[PDB]
Amino acid sequence: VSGLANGNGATGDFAGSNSQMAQVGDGDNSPLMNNFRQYLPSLPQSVECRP
């Protein structure tokens, strides 16, 4: 239960949730919340000012 939170891993009966907890993620990168990023509205960029 400590290894499914530290990110060290779990061996035993808690060995199925080691692939469910890889989808959650670690830090800023989350495989689950990066599925939403192929569908982001395309906003224009920033260029210098022309009259």
Added chain:
Amino acid sequence: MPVLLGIPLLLRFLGFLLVTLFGYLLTFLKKGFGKIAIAISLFLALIIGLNSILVG
């Protein structure tokens, strides 16, 4: 150290019951750690499930 004819068998039996009963407590402990495995699994499966609906 002289003793009567039945005392040594009362003393061996009072430690057979103890090991048998302490054997059952182990079996039940292991079962309850299996419930917390099922529970965690379920939760994380419901999250991964909602994701697939919403992104669709």
